[PDB]
Design a protein around this ligand. Structure first.
Ligand SMILES: [Mg+2]
Ligand SMILES: [Mg+2]
Ligand code: NA
Length: 257
């Protein structure tokens, strides 16, 4: 009784879903193994999605759900509450022996902000980053005047090449969006930069955690990340320590001179 003021809070549920899906993914990895990476990744995407949809229907039956692994009936556009989930972020990484840079993303959009969210990194001790416990005021623990930026693409974007002419940057290759964003939270890198396209579920939970931590999350041009859009595709993003946002936004802006 009287457990939450206006049964888990939305943040507690996000964290519990992320952890539960994380545990299931670890079970799938062990059961199926690594000999057929395609099969392994398919099973992870499918089984984590099934768990998350089952539990969201049981525990939040009134909420809409936008999942990478389910059809999108657009009822969410009428809803004031939408879960935006990536049941397995970094499917290729999950499918590769020894890789721990893959994630589960659970975000709640409320009409609008990402108000509650969790990112699990299941292979990293099933650590779950969550908007109700993550802390701010983190510290630059490396060399002054240089930036470490998490990136991951088939091929680096032109904007990165441009800003490297002006700023000392070491790109840090990390799998999945969630692992790159949590590297910022951890202080392992200063920033996470992506251009060239991404879906809402790749960034909604990381952005929620980033903003709850007092850090910066925006489009490359500095405008807010928008969610629950008809087309749930985001052309680009910057997530970073608050202190380096002006430096990087400025460099990106200058890159287009
Ligand atoms: Mg996925
Ligand atoms: Mg993804
Ligand atoms: Na389970």
């Amino acid at each position: 009784h009287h457990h939450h003021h206006s049964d888990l809070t939305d943040a507690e549920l996000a964290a519990d879903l992320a952890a539960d899906a994380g545990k299931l993914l670890l079970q799938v990895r062990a059961e199926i193994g690594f000999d057929q990476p395609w099969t392994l990744g398919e099973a992870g995407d499918r089984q984590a999605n099934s768990l998350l949809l089952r539990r969201l229907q049981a525990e939040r039956p009134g909420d809409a759900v936008l999942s990478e692994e389910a059809h999108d009936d657009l009822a969410r556009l009428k809803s004031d509450r939408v879960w935006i989930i990536d049941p397995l972020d970094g499917t290729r990484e999950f499918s590769t022996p020894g890789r721990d840079d893959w994630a589960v993303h659970i975000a709640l959009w409320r009409r609008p902000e990402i108000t509650d969210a969790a990112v699990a990194l299941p292979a990293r001790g099933n650590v779950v980053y969550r908007t109700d416990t993550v802390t701010s005021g983190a510290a630059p623990a490396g060399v002054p005047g240089t930036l470490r930026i998490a990136v991951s693409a088939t091929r680096p974007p032109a904007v990165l090449h441009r800003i490297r002419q002006t700023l000392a940057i070491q790109p840090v290759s990390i799998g999945s969006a969630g692992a790159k964003a949590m590297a910022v939270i951890d202080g392992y890198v200063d920033a996470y930069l992506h251009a060239g396209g991404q879906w809402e579920w790749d960034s909604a939970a990381p952005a929620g955690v980033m903003l709850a931590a007092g850090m910066h999350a925006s489009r490359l041009d500095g405008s807010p990340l928008r969610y629950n859009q008809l087309d749930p595709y985001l052309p680009d993003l910057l997530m970073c320590r608050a202190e380096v946002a002006p430096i990087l936004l400025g460099a990106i802006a200058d890159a287009w001179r």
